[PDB]
Structure 1
Amino acid sequence: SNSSDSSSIKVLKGLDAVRKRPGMYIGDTDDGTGLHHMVFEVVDNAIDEALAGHCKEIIVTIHADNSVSVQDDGRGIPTGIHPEEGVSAAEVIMTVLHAGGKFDDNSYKVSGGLHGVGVSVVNALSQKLELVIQREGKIHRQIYEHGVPQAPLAVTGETEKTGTMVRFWPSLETFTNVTEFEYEILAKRLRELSFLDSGVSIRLRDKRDGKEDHFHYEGGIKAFVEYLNKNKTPIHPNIFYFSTEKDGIGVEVALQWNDGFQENIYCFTNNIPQRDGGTHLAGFRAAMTRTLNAYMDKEGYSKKAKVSATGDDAREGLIAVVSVKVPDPKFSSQTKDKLVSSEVKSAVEQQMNELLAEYLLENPTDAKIVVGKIIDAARAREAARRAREMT
């Protein structure tokens, strides 16, 4: 009719569709976030090996030629010929969307990975990708150029070591504006990951200027909160912390208040951060609001001060880390920005409701100092409300 022939229907094979529409896969290819998510897509997979108790060291290097390599010491990507595909499993996971060992809990009981597209997306959006896999006594190597394998995966040598090293050179045909890696952006994620995974040595090297770091904090998310408050001024001594595992879901929370008025809840799901929060954030906020007000009410603070007390008043100056371990998580996007697994909200809420209530009662000084802050917040808030009329 109007160029509406059957031939007007174009089918994009292989990785063509991701290069064509990088947005739904990698996110923002302009503001520099999707470019860094490229390093993160690889790292996450290494962290997944760490979760399964395999990888205990990860080395991220920014090279002078504007490429990053992520080397881990896990089991290594499977190298054997695929039973259904005909080429090495290594090649399958790199060239096929929705191909991966994370479609069940057989290789990874709990993992951030689940889409079977992460590393293939990086490979697709890369001018070149070098893959070196050590496992089953052999060193394996394979070079890619825009997702297309240059030769079949080759056994280049012998080794007793196990591991996977993926080095990629992002395609500037995809990424614009921000085209070079930024050390600090990598350092932040890597540092938190270290806090989230004690025992895992994470080294960050920058071959452009020689800078480097070695994150191996062992204090967990409690030390993480301490870190988040370093150039802050916490108002109470006892960081509220708990780590439960109920109905197959793990919820770990560490939090503390400061004298500032900024709210900062860092939410994670199987170590993947949720910029857009989600069900865990929801369960956490509803739980903290119910609990804090419940304490103010039963303790008469609400009565004393006739204070409203809202979530916002409560979250003012809050530094909290909420990490959940979910067997089969759900994300509303490929970049795991929002957690949509409904069952998680209750999981976090139940635990926050019970355990935080306990915290308040067990830590009177802390509870009081915090309640004061809330009341004061509710006061200044409504004072400003009344100040509208009293202009």
Structure 2
Amino acid sequence: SYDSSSIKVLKGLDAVRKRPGMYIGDTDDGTGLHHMVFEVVDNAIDEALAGHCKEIIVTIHADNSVSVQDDGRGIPTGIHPEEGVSAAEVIMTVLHAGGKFDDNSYKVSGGLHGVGVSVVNALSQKLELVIQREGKIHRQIYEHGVPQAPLAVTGETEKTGTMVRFWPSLETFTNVTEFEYEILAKRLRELSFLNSGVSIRLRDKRDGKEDHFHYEGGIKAFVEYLNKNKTPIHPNIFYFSTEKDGIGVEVALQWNDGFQENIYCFTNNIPQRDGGTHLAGFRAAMTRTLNAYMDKEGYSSATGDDAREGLIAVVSVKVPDPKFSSQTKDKLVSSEVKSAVEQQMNELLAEYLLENPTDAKIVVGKIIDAARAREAARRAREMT
């Protein structure tokens, strides 16, 4: 019988537990599990982007919980006037709630859905929240997303910040159920390059291992790091940072003598594993600018792919209201970011090639060589 009684409304966080795939991703291969950590970290990085947090500490505890401490402003603790409970609890228990739906609290932020930390809460058998703010320490415990008591003041402090510790629920997560140091370290190292002046620490209480990431030199240094085990073919990394029409575009790149393409794309510091409009705009401008240079210099047929070979690049954009296809933010779907990246790249890469003739000639040589190897491969296939 299919009728009004067959229609069910899921309340509170029940939808997150019922359909975890659309909130956390894969609950069996480990990617979702680590994403729980990254949601919490991304909120601390957003305080850093806002100018209020200079230290983030991520700890893997010996009981397979993870904590993230920041020295930012603290999650607001006062009673929410419409909801009638602490704003912190509203944040933990309600989907599409937060401070990132306008630009008053965070000019730019990776956060935008008002979902992240409520997902972590919903899919955790236990979550501990400690907030330092307005001279007071506040604490609250949750179990499977359910607060055990209202947020309470437990003492005094001269500090500000948020600490979230969570124990992931094995009723949701399967197979890969323990945290992997290196997965966290890769992300935190990257965030250090992307956030100069922010101290990021990682501690594993299981074995005493620790790292302190505080790289200087930003995404240019990031490119050096990435080309470390490779062989750069020209000495001058191309780099710029601009802010035009409300969009920040920061790019660094350098070619190596290998044959892969590795473009790392970021939007408000969140990586897009599956690319997007920023990657689309980067590719377009590279192709156009290189072809124009080769045409003008009489070196001209190479396609976009030949310029891709041996390339390492980092594309980092800062956008007031970006659009992602999902909560995990694997893909940027904002058409105006394509235009901003393409426009800035076309202007500044053309200037780089004029100002750095030695590099320009090496890169042209590489593009020609990649095109030659591609045609030889095609001919060889046809002849088998």
Q: 1:377 aligns with which of 367, 370, 374?
A: 370
Give the distance between the partners of 2:94 and 2:140, measured in 1 at CA. 15
- 1:328-347 CA deviation, whole Å, 9 max, x = no partner? 11111111111111110000
In the other structure, the counterpart of 2:345 is 352
CA-to-partner distance for each residue in 1:269-293, whole Å, 9 max, x for gaps?
A: 0001111111100000000011111
| 1:7 Cα deviation from its structure 2 partner | 1.4
TM-fit CA distance, 1:9: 1.1
Which deviations, in whole Å up to 9, do the C-alpha atoms of 1:349-372 show, x marking residues without a partner? Answer: 001111001111111111111111
Which residue of structure 1 aligns with residue 358 of structure 2?
365
| Residue 96 (structure 1) aligned with residue 94 (structure 2) | yes
> Separation in 1 of the partners of 2:381 and 2:220?
41
Q: Distance in 1 between matches of 2:383 and 2:2?
A: 64
In 2, Cα distance between the equivalents of 1:134 and 1:219?
32
Q: State the shift of 1:10 in Å.
A: 1.4
- Could you tell me how far apart the structure 2 residues matched to 1:338 and 1:13 are? 28
Q: Tell me the equivalent position of 1:216.
A: 214
Q: Note the C-alpha offset of 1:296.
A: 1.4
* Distance of 1:291 and 1:117 partners within structure 2: 40
State the alpha-carbon separation in 1 of the partners of residues 215 and 12 from structure 2. 40
Deviations 1:83-136 (A, max 9, x none): 110000010000000000000001000000010000000000101000000000
Deviation at 1:389, TM superposition (A): 2.6
CA shift at 1:383, angstroms?
1.0
Q: 2-side partners of 1:293 and 1:384: how far apart?
A: 22
Partners of 2:232 and 2:210 in 1: CA distance:
30
Which residue matches 2:127?
Answer: 129
Report SS of the residue matched to 2:36. Answer: helix
Work out the CA distance in 2 between the residues paired with 1:318 and 1:30: 33
| Structure 2 SS opposite 1:301 | coil
Aligned-partner Cα distance in 2 for 1:251–1:166:
32
What SS class does the counterpart of residue 2 from structure 2 fall into? coil
What is the DSSP-based 3-state SS (H/G/I as helix, E as strand, rest coil) of the residue aligned with 2:266? strand
Output the TM-score relative to the length of structure 1.
0.97
Q: Take 1:91 and 1:389, find their aligned partners in 2: how far apart are those partners?
A: 65
1:241-282, CA deviations, whole angstroms, 9 ceiling, x for partnerless residues?
A: 000100000000011010111110000000011111111000
How far apart, CA to CA, are the structure 1 residues paired with 2:319 and 2:244?
11
Map Cα deviations across residues 32-89 of structure 1 (whole Å, 9 max, x no partner): 1111110000000000000010000000000000010000000000000001100000
The C-alpha deviation readout for 1:167-211, integer Å capped at 9, x for no partner, is 000111111111110000000000010000011000000000000
Aligned residues: 384
1:389 and 1:108 map into 2 onto residues whose CA distance is 57
Q: Give the deviation of 1:161 after TM superposition.
A: 0.4
Residues 370-390 of structure 1 show CA distances to partners (whole Å, capped at 9, x for unaligned) of 111110100110111111232
- C-alpha distance in 2 between matches for 1:257 and 1:32: 33
Look up the match of 1:15: 13
How far 1:5 sits from its partner (Å)? 2.1
1:317 and 1:32 map into 2 onto residues whose CA distance is: 30
Which 5+ residue runs of structure 2 have no aligned equivalent? none
Superposition RMSD in Å: 0.7
Seq. identity, %: 99
Partner Cα separation in structure 1 for residue 217 and residue 250 of structure 2: 13
Q: Which runs of 4+ in 1 moved over 4 A?
A: none
> Does the residue aligned with 1:28 lie in a helix, a strand or coil?
coil
Q: CA deviation at 1:213?
A: 0.2
Structure 1 unaligned residues grouped into runs of 5+: 303-307
| Partners of 1:33 and 1:284 in 2: CA distance | 27
SS of the residue 1:157 aligns to: strand
TM-score of the two chains, using structure 2 as the length reference: 0.99
Distance 2:167 2:40 in 1: 13
SS of aligned partner of 2:228: coil
